Design an enzyme around this catalytic site. Sequence first.
Site, PDB file in Angstrom:
ATOM      1  N   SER A   1      47.654  45.494  56.835  1.00 13.81           N
ATOM      2  CA  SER A   1      47.112  44.913  55.590  1.00 13.81           C
ATOM      3  C   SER A   1      48.256  44.485  54.696  1.00 13.81           C
ATOM      4  CB  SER A   1      46.119  45.885  54.947  1.00 13.81           C
ATOM      5  OG  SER A   1      45.447  45.257  53.874  1.00 13.81           O
TER       6      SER A   1
ATOM      7  N   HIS B   1      38.010  46.792  57.654  1.00 10.42           N
ATOM      8  CA  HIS B   1      39.427  46.761  57.322  1.00 10.42           C
ATOM      9  C   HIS B   1      40.089  48.131  57.334  1.00 10.42           C
ATOM     10  CE1 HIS B   1      42.912  44.735  55.758  1.00 10.42           C
ATOM     11  NE2 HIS B   1      42.989  45.561  54.716  1.00 10.42           N
TER      12      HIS B   1
ATOM     13  N   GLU C   1      36.948  42.355  58.619  1.00 16.78           N
ATOM     14  CA  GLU C   1      37.917  42.653  57.563  1.00 16.78           C
ATOM     15  C   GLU C   1      37.317  42.592  56.154  1.00 16.78           C
ATOM     16  OE1 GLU C   1      40.693  43.684  58.622  1.00 16.78           O
ATOM     17  OE2 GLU C   1      41.670  42.365  60.063  1.00 16.78           O
TER      18      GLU C   1
HETATM   19  C1  LIG Z   1      35.609  35.378  47.229  1.00 12.12           C
HETATM   20  C2  LIG Z   1      36.755  36.072  46.469  1.00 12.12           C
HETATM   21  C3  LIG Z   1      38.104  35.538  47.000  1.00 12.12           C
HETATM   22  C4  LIG Z   1      39.281  36.408  46.489  1.00 12.12           C
HETATM   23  C5  LIG Z   1      40.597  35.749  46.672  1.00 12.12           C
HETATM   24  C6  LIG Z   1      41.083  35.850  48.143  1.00 12.12           C
HETATM   25  C7  LIG Z   1      42.409  35.112  48.444  1.00 12.12           C
HETATM   26  C8  LIG Z   1      43.647  35.937  48.013  1.00 12.12           C
HETATM   27  C9  LIG Z   1      44.023  37.017  49.043  1.00 12.12           C
HETATM   28  C10 LIG Z   1      45.316  37.711  48.533  1.00 12.12           C
HETATM   29  C11 LIG Z   1      45.875  38.728  49.527  1.00 12.12           C
HETATM   30  C12 LIG Z   1      44.996  39.962  49.438  1.00 12.12           C
HETATM   31  C13 LIG Z   1      45.223  40.885  50.528  1.00 12.12           C
HETATM   32  C14 LIG Z   1      46.466  41.713  50.571  1.00 12.12           C
HETATM   33  C15 LIG Z   1      46.143  42.878  51.522  1.00 12.12           C
HETATM   34  C16 LIG Z   1      45.453  43.990  50.857  1.00 12.12           C
HETATM   35  C17 LIG Z   1      43.986  44.246  50.805  1.00 12.12           C
HETATM   36  C18 LIG Z   1      43.623  45.585  50.237  1.00 12.12           C
HETATM   37  C19 LIG Z   1      43.649  46.662  51.278  1.00 12.12           C
HETATM   38  C20 LIG Z   1      43.299  48.031  50.811  1.00 12.12           C
HETATM   39  C21 LIG Z   1      43.386  48.945  51.985  1.00 12.12           C
HETATM   40  C22 LIG Z   1      44.760  49.474  52.136  1.00 12.12           C
HETATM   41  C23 LIG Z   1      45.083  49.882  53.474  1.00 12.12           C
HETATM   42  O1  LIG Z   1      44.706  50.946  53.936  1.00 12.12           O
HETATM   43  O2  LIG Z   1      45.801  49.175  54.070  1.00 12.12           O
END
Ligand SMILES: CCCCCCCCCCCCCCCCCCCCCCC(=O)O
Lengths: 534, 534
Positions: B209, B449, B341
Amino acid sequence: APTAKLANGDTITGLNAIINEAFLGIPFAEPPVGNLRFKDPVPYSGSLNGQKFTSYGPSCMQQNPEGTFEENLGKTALDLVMQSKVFQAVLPQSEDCLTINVVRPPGTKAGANLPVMLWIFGGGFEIGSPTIFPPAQMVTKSVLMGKPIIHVAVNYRVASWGFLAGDDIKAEGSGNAGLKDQRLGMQWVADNIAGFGGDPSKVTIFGESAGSMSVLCHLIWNDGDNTYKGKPLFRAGIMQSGAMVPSDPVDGTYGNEIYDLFVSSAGCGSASDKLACLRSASSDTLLDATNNTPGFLAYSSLRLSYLPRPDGKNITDDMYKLVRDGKYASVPVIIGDQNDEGTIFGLSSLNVTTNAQARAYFKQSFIHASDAEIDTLMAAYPQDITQGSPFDTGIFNAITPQFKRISAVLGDLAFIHARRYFLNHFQGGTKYSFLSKQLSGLPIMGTFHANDIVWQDYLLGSGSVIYNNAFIAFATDLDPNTAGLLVNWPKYTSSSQSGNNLMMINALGLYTGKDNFRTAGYDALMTNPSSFFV
Amino acid sequence: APTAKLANGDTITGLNAIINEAFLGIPFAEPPVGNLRFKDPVPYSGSLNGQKFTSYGPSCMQQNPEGTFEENLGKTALDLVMQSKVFQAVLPQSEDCLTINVVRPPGTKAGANLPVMLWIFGGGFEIGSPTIFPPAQMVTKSVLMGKPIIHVAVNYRVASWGFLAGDDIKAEGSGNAGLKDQRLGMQWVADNIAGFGGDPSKVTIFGESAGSMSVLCHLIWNDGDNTYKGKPLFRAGIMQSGAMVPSDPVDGTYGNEIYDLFVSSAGCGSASDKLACLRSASSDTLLDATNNTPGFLAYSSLRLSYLPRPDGKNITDDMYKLVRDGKYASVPVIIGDQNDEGTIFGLSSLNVTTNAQARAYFKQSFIHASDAEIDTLMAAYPQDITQGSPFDTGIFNAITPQFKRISAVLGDLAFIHARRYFLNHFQGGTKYSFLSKQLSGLPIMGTFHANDIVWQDYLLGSGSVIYNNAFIAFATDLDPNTAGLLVNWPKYTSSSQSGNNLMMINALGLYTGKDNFRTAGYDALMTNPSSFFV
Ligand SMILES: CCCCCCCCCCCCCCCCCCCCCCC(=O)O
Ligand SMILES: *[C@@H]1O[C@H](CO)[C@@H](O[C@@H]2O[C@H](CO)[C@@H](O)[C@H](O)[C@H]2NC(C)=O)[C@H](O)[C@H]1NC(C)=O
Ligand SMILES: *[C@@H]1O[C@H](CO)[C@@H](O[C@@H]2O[C@H](CO)[C@@H](O)[C@H](O)[C@H]2NC(C)=O)[C@H](O)[C@H]1NC(C)=O
Ligand SMILES: *[C@@H]1O[C@H](CO)[C@@H](O[C@@H]2O[C@H](CO)[C@@H](O)[C@H](O)[C@H]2NC(C)=O)[C@H](O)[C@H]1NC(C)=O
Ligand SMILES: *[C@@H]1O[C@H](CO)[C@@H](O[C@@H]2O[C@H](CO)[C@@H](O)[C@H](O)[C@H]2NC(C)=O)[C@H](O)[C@H]1NC(C)=O
Ligand SMILES: CCCCCCCCCCCCCCCCCCCCCCC(=O)O
């Protein structure tokens, strides 16, 4: 430090917690260990003179809510959690657990003669303890209202330790051990609470979920003779979610089936004296054996492995019949529900997705129901996702095509229509009823089972004016309306009465409504309640 | 006791945990406290000679996942858990957190020249630490396989401490502090790991992640120059869910918007020198200010408050464009996903129930997308509940009419189609890709996820042969197939190649399939990726 003299003349010391004075962990019974397992509690015989009671004692032994004879990740997850050093440090457990807890307003003296709110915790008859139902919010509110109360919380045995059943238990006279623990605690209050500042003639018993059903059981106990030393043990009851237990006798089918599984799992299957074999086992052996029987979040769900059952002695018959036939104590009562009691429990059968599978689940759960009675049930509680629980959520919350339906059945049989049956038949006192919609819109769960614990013990919310203020007023004056509510609480006479008869709660406050919903479901379940017993 | 000589000649002592030898809590940077907040990490200057490293140090400061400038019960609930003494005793936190952890097979000596698996934890760039990603399962398996590895886990700053952005940060050159922490840890491994039995020339970086996206960032860091003292810092990468960060630069709109909110919340809104004001604040002041900005479970969801952003310096541009233009290190890679995810993140917008509301949510989240681009997105990701995530579940899991749709979009942009873009453009080395369906049927979440953490670090399941065995073999031999998998893992060349190009996992084991699904959604998102950046 705070002190109190017990009936026998022992002086004990408590804790000045500034916001209240607490006497925590007082033994009221001999430890029910070894050869006293499963038996009636024995009154505590020793002296407590000069001892300090300033922290909660351990819980009684706790069953894994995801326990089962099957293997699965949920059983495993909760097992790791409950076995961790961290968990064991914060919430210790022991078979030596029969303690009682007294929490009073600051400055209360012996002779204050305050009303007593005697709390019976709930946890499926399988988990819980007084420790996790903090009384401070209630006690503090009572003082602010000018209606100070003393809160008393009794510990009692749960799961196999408290509600083992089957033929051997029946024949020994050992049914419903945990209710007997509660009863002995009530007697302890009668004899001892005066020296803490309480009036033993003004005890209101109250509980949520298994604790609410326990309050009912205390009404029908000994066919409603609630006397002790010539005086009633309580003068009022409050039931937060639950009335009659829809259960077959101790020596019925499922009590024996669970007993046989427990015996086998404990290594006692070759015994000729199975109860002696069990009494000889290590604590760990009995814990493992208990966790090899279903817990209340397992697939079996509210078809509980451990729960109160008629024993022909202290609960003399089918509890629905007892109430129908007038075999209860005469006291005024409050009884109510959360709108969506069943949703958490519906999460236990999410592999049930078709009508046929729902039918098979209902038939497995309701071994006495005929095909015609199941047909009637499944007509009253249709698949139509808009009609199930969370109620009034349309096509939302449809985890499966059956989840909202199963949730609705569970919630109504175990709690909501059980309450209506009670209210329609109970003539022993003035009745008041509530229905909370405080959390309408909360996804999946709705206004879910036990959320009232949050608003009663942990946080302030709109419902706190009922769960704290009205209940304190009831305990004080036998009328919740002396709380000065912004809405008058009408008396409940029957579900057919002409006017509004429910105190309602939503996120913005109080209003009133009627107990006239899901009548087809009531008729399906309650025409012959014993057809839906476990 | 286990011992190791560092490059400076210091000898340190670790822990013999029997199943491995662990050197835990080794400082690699000066404490980034006070006037060093938000700045590049300073290499640690002191002597560690004679010191013992036998337990994990504190995490870096953690943002409440339900943090926000709004008030709500979820934010409250998590604050009271993270603030409890019990939590703080088990998982302590501190700004003085830049430690590294080396866990090696039993009996490993200096000179063993073992491959190194360098773990970069994930937590939304807002929570997490090495402590909760136990390396024992990996290390034990590597020995079993005859392919022993050394596991190294680097701590790095998260949330505001690690990823503060905006104009002032950019002008100072202080972007992406937590990636700089990771990079300094990689340099530490290069200089020091030989003393532990590791081969610094055989480091594979891996993460899940935010840690997986961090691996991508390390591929494009310094336009793909991954050397230190002229030598590569790593020879391979493994990306468990996540490739490019779809983010605007440090000094773009939302970086500045969050900075301004943080500054204001920290009491520094009247400052002419805002960074100096922040650097002067108490630790608690910065913690509270951070929790007054959205966390990754708040409504804003994966429109993260804190994440890596192009800075014009070490991440020189739009990371999609960096990968298109070949500005990466030439190493072989594994990258994969969990099928569902997006589902946990879709739980953050359950008040979004109509198509109009979905449109508005998408437009709030994607400030650069035109109405036509939103139309194209909402055609590719239709309301039709059967087409969303959890995939292949028909009318099931319909918490709301939009939940499965929103989950699908979130999952594809942040992880699954981002991976496909990466794979189609990356020519730096051999590629292998996986897709897990290990938990198909799990209600609401599906194959969710981070479930791979469970099978990598905590329990054995069908996927562990990938997350442990295949990854070990890849770190050893740069080919996952030397694990002797029951199914050969085909090389990935592009999403249009003729044969199966995905290693697939289900509950019963391995199979292969094609990366050719949801092509309309790929096209909607990835024709102009920067239209969907945050
Ligand atoms: C429809 C709403 C859209 C929201 C915007 C999406 C686009 C931006 C994405 C930005 C990157 C976000 C992801 C970064 C990875 C982290 C996600 C959180 C994970 C929490 C779990 C942690 C783990 O155990 O790994
Ligand atoms: C449960 O019911 C039994 C049976 O009625 C009670 O036992 C009686 O106790 C009374 C005391 O009031 C004795 O005088 C009777 O002789 C007992 N009868 C029998 C058949 O034993 C018992 O007290 C009840 N237990 C509780 C906890 O209420
Ligand atoms: C839903 O899952 C439950 C729990 O696993 C299934 O019930 C178990 O099924 C196995 C296989 O027949 C039996 O050995 C167990 O004794 C059952 N347990 C209980 C408590 O009944 C159940 O069959 C599944 N339901 C559906 C519709 O698939
Ligand atoms: C981030 O990028 C900057 C810019 O290339 C790097 O800065 C160079 O650092 C070297 C060695 O530390 C200096 O000799 C150069 O003078 C710097 N160049 C400029 C123009 O700043 C920096 O090293 C990179 N950081 C990391 C951790 O890779
Ligand atoms: C769903 O709830 C979110 C979170 O409360 C709503 O967004 C907030 O709306 C309030 C009221 O307008 C604003 O003051 C906040 O700034 C908003 N927060 C964010 C992060 O945008 C949102 O409007 C609700 N969605 C729907 C469809 O009702
Ligand atoms: C469709 C499946 C039908 C299953 C059988 C239902 C009929 C039997 C009901 C028996 C009584 C069960 C309920 C007893 C109350 C406890 C419920 C568990 C509550 C756990 C929360 C504990 C709490 O906080 O109080």
